[PDB]
Design a protein around this ligand. Structure first.
Ligand code: NA
Ligand SMILES: [Zn+2]
Lengths: 317, 76
């Protein structure tokens, strides 16, 4: 029996020493096995594999513990889906555009580029070590791992069409939003006032208007009495908010928002570009940049910086 | 109890539901009646995203509430 020595891992930190038989596939020995993202399950060890690190599926208690602590998921399919995505995302290009890590277009990835571009402008931290480590690398321009993780956490595959708002929602479940807090009032001329408090991801997301000012001044919403009521923001504590709405023509003006994305197309297929407010507005389409003093188009998500906001609106007399 | 679901096009869907029903179950009722596949449907209540595995009760959706049906975007 001839062997080579390799290391297996689920977290790239804890490495497990292995001796593998050259006459058996990696699948016969570890099960699903990946070398820099590439699926090597069906092949036999090569002399050139000596001393290399391989990713494996968590197949014992130690590996399962390490995977859980690193990824913050109990989903047995996770590593396999992560590696499957990584084999493609490692081939993507991550140019710096307007000082931000972007993604050159490939594999229907414009929604992912808009997610990545927006995150870099938010004061946000991830809890899962896998995301912390990969996000740091992504900020540094090395974003393949982070992109593959976005796909794995979102239960999406490379090439699948996607929604920035939905993807952001998945990612933010793993962000530290423990102190994010939103208080909303709803006032009806007949029914009076009702108040609710939202925390975590729900405190920083909204679907119905792009305008943070509108949420502050009043959004018309149906009341159970059959009349219209007014919903408004009483208090917000978070480092940002994301305001979303079905795509519609909207004007982005300098000095009024952090960043945004627009969706051009229809409900069957569209394409995203990102707009960031710098010394002027920058529209970022993958590797491409267009500078402009304002942007009018089918905006669907707008991000705003926040610290603490308290309303000036008083209860009705 | 009756609830209402306002679509993007401006139609109001009228449903008979119970507080215990899951959001997934509400989507199933929408599908049979309007032919909208549940995987495309995204239900919103006063700006808040509703999730499939949770229930109307979880969101304090009571009688005569109106939800909004928006659609998942399909960006390349
Ligand atoms: Na984009
Ligand atoms: Zn009322």
């Amino acid at each position: 029996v001839k062997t080579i020595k390799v290391f297996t891992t689920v977290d790239n930190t804890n490495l497990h020493t292995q001796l593998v038989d050259m006459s058996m596939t990696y699948g016969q020995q570890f099960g699903p096995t990946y070398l820099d993202g590439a699926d090597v399950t069906k092949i036999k060890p090569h002399v050139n594999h000596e001393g290399k690190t391989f990713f494996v599926l968590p197949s014992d208690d130690t590996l399962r513990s390490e995977a859980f602590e690193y990824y913050h998921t109990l989903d047995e399919s996770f590593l396999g889906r992560y590696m499957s995505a990584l084999n493609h995302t490692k081939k993507w290009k991550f140019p710096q555009v307007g000082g931000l890590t972007s993604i050159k277009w490939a594999d229907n990835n414009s929604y992912l580029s808009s997610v990545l571009l927006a995150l870099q402008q938010l004061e946000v931290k991830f809890n899962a070590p896998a995301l912390q480590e990969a996000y740091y690398r992504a900020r540094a321009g090395d974003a393949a791992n982070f992109c593959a993780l976005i796909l794995a956490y979102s239960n999406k595959t490379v090439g699948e069409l996607g929604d920035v708002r939905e993807t952001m929602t998945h990612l933010l479940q793993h962000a530290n939003l423990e102190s994010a807090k939103r208080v909303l009032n709803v006032v009806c001329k007949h029914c009076g006032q009702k108040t609710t408090t939202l925390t975590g991801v729900e405190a920083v997301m909204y679907m119905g208007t792009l305008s943070y000012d509108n949420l502050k001044t009043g959004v018309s919403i149906p009341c159970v009495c059959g009349r219209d009521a007014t919903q408004y923001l009483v208090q917000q504590e978070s480092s940002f908010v994301m305001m979303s709405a079905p795509p519609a023509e909207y004007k982005l003006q300098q000095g009024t928002f952090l960043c945004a994305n627009e969706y051009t197309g229809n409900y069957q297929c569209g394409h995203y570009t990102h707009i960031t407010a710098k010394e002027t507005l920058y529209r970022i389409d993958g590797a491409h940049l267009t500078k402009m003093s304002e942007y009018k188009g089918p905006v669907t998500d707008v991000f705003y910086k926040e610290t603490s906001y308290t309303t000036t609106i008083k209860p009705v007399s | 109890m009756q609830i209402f679901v306002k679509t993007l096009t401006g139609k109001t869907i009228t449903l008979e539901v119970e507080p215990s029903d899951t959001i997934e179950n509400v989507k199933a009722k929408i599908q049979d009646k309007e032919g909208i596949p549940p995987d495309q449907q995204r239900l919103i209540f006063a700006g808040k995203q509703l999730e499939d595995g949770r229930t109307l009760s979880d969101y304090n959706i009571q009688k005569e509430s109106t939800l909004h049906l928006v659609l998942r975007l399909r960006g390349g």
